Ligand binder design. Structure first.
Ligand code: GTF
Ligand code: MG
Ligand code: MG
Ligand code: NA
Ligand code: NA
Ligand code: NA
Ligand code: NA
Length: 312
DNA sequence: CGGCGGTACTG
DNA sequence: CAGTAC
DNA sequence: GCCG
C-alpha cells in the first residue's frame, strides 16, 4: 500500500487508453513495490529494485515526500467512460476511444446510437452478468453439463475444467473446458455435435466466437445459463485439442495469464518457444516431448507447480 | 535499440 | 489487415 | 514504464 495505491490508478489509466507497454511497466514496478521487505525511503534504494528504474524512482520520491503525485492531476476525465465502454465484451480500447470521440458517454448512448458488432451486442445485453463471478460450485455444474453432453456421443472424451477453477479459486469469472480424446483422433468434428446438443437443450444462449464452418475449429466462446430461478448468464469457453498437445494445452488453459506470459518469456531466453500447441526450439525448430505438464517444467529448468501455485 | 506471450476469430 | 479475445 |  501507500505509494502503490497512487501508481495503480495511473497504471489503469494507461491500460484503458491503450498505452499497453507503459501500463505493463507500471504493472511490474508495482509488483516489485509489493514484495520489497521495507518502505523505500531513498532514490538509491528504489532504483536498486528489479522492476524500478530512474523514472519510477523519481515518482516514488515524490509520493511519500510531498504526499502527492502531480501525474494523477493530468488523468483525462475520459478514463472512467473508456473503462465503462471497455467492459463491453468485444469492445477494446480502440472502440471505446472512438465512441468517446463521437460523443458517447453512457451505455444508454451506446444502446441507442452506436453501431454494434454481433459480439458487442451480446456483450451489452449481458453487461452486468459478464462482470460477476460465480461460485466455484456453479462452475462445476456447468463443466459437468458440457462433459455429460460430450460423453454422450463418445464416452472416451476427456473433459477438464481449467482456468481459475483448476487453480482452486473460490469464484470464477467463467468456465474453461478443455476437451481431448486419449486415442489421439476422436476429438475431430466434435464441436458441431456437442454445440448442437447444448443448443438443443437450451443450455447455450449466445455465441461469441465459433467458426463452425471450419472443420478445424479450435475454440468456442459463448454464453450459457443453468435452469431454475436466480440463475445468471455465464461465460463459457471450450477448446478441443489433439491428445498430442494435451499437456501444453492444459498448461496454457490453466494459467494464470501472467504465469503463461512469464513461462513463455523464460522459454525464449532458453532458446525455446512455448504455446498452447507445444514447446519447441526457436524457421522450423524442433518440437520437444511433453507428455505431461511436469515435462514442460522440467525442460525449462523449473520445479513443477500445482495449478494453485500458478495463481500469479 | 527494441521486446515486453503466443495464438484463434471476426469483419 | 486491425482489433479483440483466450 | 522496465529490461538486456
Ligand atoms: N491474456 C490472456 C488471458 C487468458 N489466458 C489463458 O486462458 C485461460 C482462460 O482465460 P480466462 O477464463 O479469461 O481467465 P481466468 O484465469 O480463468 O480468470 P477468470 O475466472 O476471471 O476467467 C487462463 O486461465 C489463461 F491461462 F490465462 C492467457 O494465456 N492470456
Ligand atoms: Mg476462466
Ligand atoms: Mg475463459
Ligand atoms: Na533497476
Ligand atoms: Na471489452
Ligand atoms: Na458462427
Ligand atoms: Na441474466
Amino acid at each position: 500500500l501507500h505509494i502503490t495505491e497512487k501508481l495503480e490508478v495511473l497504471a489503469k489509466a494507461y491500460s484503458v487508453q491503450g498505452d499497453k507497454w507503459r501500463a505493463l511497466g507500471y504493472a511490474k514496478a508495482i509488483n516489485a513495490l509489493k514484495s520489497f521487505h521495507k518502505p523505500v525511503t531513498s532514490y538509491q534504494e528504489a532504483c536498486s529494485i528489479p522492476g524500478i528504474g530512474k523514472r519510477m524512482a523519481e515518482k516514488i520520491i515524490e509520493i511519500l515526500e510531498s504526499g502527492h503525485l502531480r501525474k494523477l492531476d493530468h488523468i483525462s476525465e475520459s478514463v472512467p467512460v473508456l473503462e465503462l465502454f471497455s467492459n463491453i465484451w468485444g469492445a477494446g480500447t480502440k472502440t471505446a476511444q472512438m465512441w468517446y470521440q463521437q460523443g458517447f458517454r453512457s451505455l444508454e448512448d451506446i444502446r441507442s446510437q452506436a453501431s454494434l458488432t454481433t459480439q458487442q451486442a451480446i456483450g451489452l445485453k449481458h453487461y452486468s452478468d459478464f462482470l460477476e463471478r460465480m461460485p466455484r460450485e456453479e462452475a462445476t455444474e456447468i463443466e459437468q453439463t458440457v462433459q455429460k453432453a460430450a460423453q454422450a456421443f463418445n464416452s472416451g472424451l476427456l473433459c477438464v475444467a481449467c482456468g481459475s477453477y483448476r487453480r482452486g479459486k473460490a469464484t470464477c469469472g467463467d468456465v474453461d473446458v478443455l476437451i481431448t480424446h486419449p486415442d489421439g483422433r476422436s476429438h475431430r468434428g466434435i464441436f458441431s455435435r456437442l454445440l448442437d446438443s447444448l443448443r438443443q437443450e437450451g443450455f447455450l444462449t449466445d455465441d461469441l466466437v465459433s467458426q463452425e464452418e471450419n472443420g478445424q475449429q479450435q475454440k468456442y466462446l459463448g454464453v450459457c445459463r443453468l435452469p431454475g430461478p436466480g440463475r445468471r448468464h455465464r461465460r463459457l469457453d471450450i477448446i478441443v485439442v489433439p491428445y498430442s498437445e494435451f499437456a501444453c494445452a492444459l498448461l496454457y488453459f490453466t494459467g494464470s495469464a501472467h504465469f503463461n506470459r512469464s513461462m513463455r518469456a523464460l522459454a525464449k531466453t532458453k532458446g525455446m518457444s512455448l504455446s498452447e500447441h507445444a514447446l519447441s526450439t526457436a524457421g522450423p525448430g524442433r518440437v520437444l516431448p511433453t507428455p505431461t505438464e511436469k515435462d514442460v517444467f522440467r525442460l525449462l529448468g523449473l520445479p513443477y507447480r500445482e495449478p494453485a501455485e500458478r495463481d500469479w
